[PDB]
Amino acid sequence: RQWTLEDFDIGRPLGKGKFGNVYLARERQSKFILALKVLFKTQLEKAGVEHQLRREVEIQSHLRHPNILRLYGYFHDATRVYLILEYAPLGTVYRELQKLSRFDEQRTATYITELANALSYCHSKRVIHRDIKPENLLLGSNGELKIADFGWSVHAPSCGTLDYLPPEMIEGRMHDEKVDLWSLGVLCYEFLVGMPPFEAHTYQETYRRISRVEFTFPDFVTEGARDLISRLLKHNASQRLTLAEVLEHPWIKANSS
Numbered sequence: 362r363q364w365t366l367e368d369f370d371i372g373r374p375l376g377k378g379k380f381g382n383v384y385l386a387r388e389r390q391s392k393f394i395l396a397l398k399v400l401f402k403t404q405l406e407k408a409g410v411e412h413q414l415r416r417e418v419e420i421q422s423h424l425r426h427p428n429i430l431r432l433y434g435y436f437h438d439a440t441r442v443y444l445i446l447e448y449a450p451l452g453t454v455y456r457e458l459q460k461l462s463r464f465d466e467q468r469t470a471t472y473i474t475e476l477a478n479a480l481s482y483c484h485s486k487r488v489i490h491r492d493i494k495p496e497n498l499l500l501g502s503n504g505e506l507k508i509a510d511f512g513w514s515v516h517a518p519s520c521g522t523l524d525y526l527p528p529e530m531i532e533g534r535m536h537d538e539k540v541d542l543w544s545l546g547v548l549c550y551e552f553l554v555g556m557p558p559f560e561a562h563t564y565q566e567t568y569r570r571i572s573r574v575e576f577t578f579p580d581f582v583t584e585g586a587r588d589l590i591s592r593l594l595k596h597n598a599s600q601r602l603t604l605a606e607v608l609e610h611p612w613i614k615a616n617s618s
């Protein structure tokens with residue numbers, strides 16, 4: 362089917378995203394509940410990212426995993442581009458983290474497990490996400506973590522704050538699948554602490570701290586969590602833990618559900 366906007370009943374705004382807003386939507390024939398992100402053609406052309414969006418649709422057409430948000434397809438009119446997306450009823454992990462300030466070890470390890478599984482699937486079909494962050498993680502009906510937004514994704518090897526990016530990427534160097542592993546380490550830190558490890562008021566300071574791998578743990582972080590994060594956040598990408606090593610880490614096994 363060739364989708365048009367007239368096929369959908371538009372609901373309430375679900376959030377404000379990269380190049381436009383995400384709305385709740387219902388397909389008129391089947392009454393199916395979904396999400397539509399509305400992007401503008403001018404904004405996509407001016408950024409020179411139209412090929413990246415075409416790649417995302419392509420990449421998402423092949424990917425099938427319960428911990429990955431579905432992109433069903435897209436369509437456009439005169440001015441706007443519409444992404445047909447799976448609805449995530451429990452919102453962003455970003456919103457959940459603001460609500461709870463920080464997650465307990467049980468919730469964190471469960472998310473990391475789910476993340477790792479999703480990434481393990483992506484890396485086997487050789488896809489790197491490159492944009493792992495709380496705002497690109499959503500929660501399904503049963504509170505399961507779902508990864509979204511493959512706009513910055515590439516095949517290995519090869520917008521916002523610098524917080525989740527590894528030293529190789531910020532320095533404009535060569536990078537592979539191990540970037541998602543660094544971002545997972547940043548995630549795990551932020552989930553438990555409430556803020557990312559290299560957080561700063563300035564871009565330049567954040568750049569300094571990532572380059573040096575300059576970060577400390579607060580007193581309440583356990584040694585098990587400290588171990589995982591330290592072994593994920595290593596300047597040398599080849600020295601970082603693999604996803605299987607993460608899923609088999611003592612602290613993950615002990616706290617994950």
Ligand SMILES: Nc1ncnc(NCCc2cnc(NC(=O)Nc3cccc(C(F)(F)F)c3)s2)c1Br
Pocket residue numbers: 375376378379380383396398400405410411413414415417430444446447448449450452453499509510511512513
């Ligand atoms: N509760 C919810 N339930 C379901 N979805 C929600 N939000 C949508 C999450 C997304 C998933 N995928 C996305 N994709 C992109 O937008 N990609 C994108 C965007 C701009 C430019 C580009 C590019 F052109 F630069 F690549 C690529 S946004 C929410 Br809140």
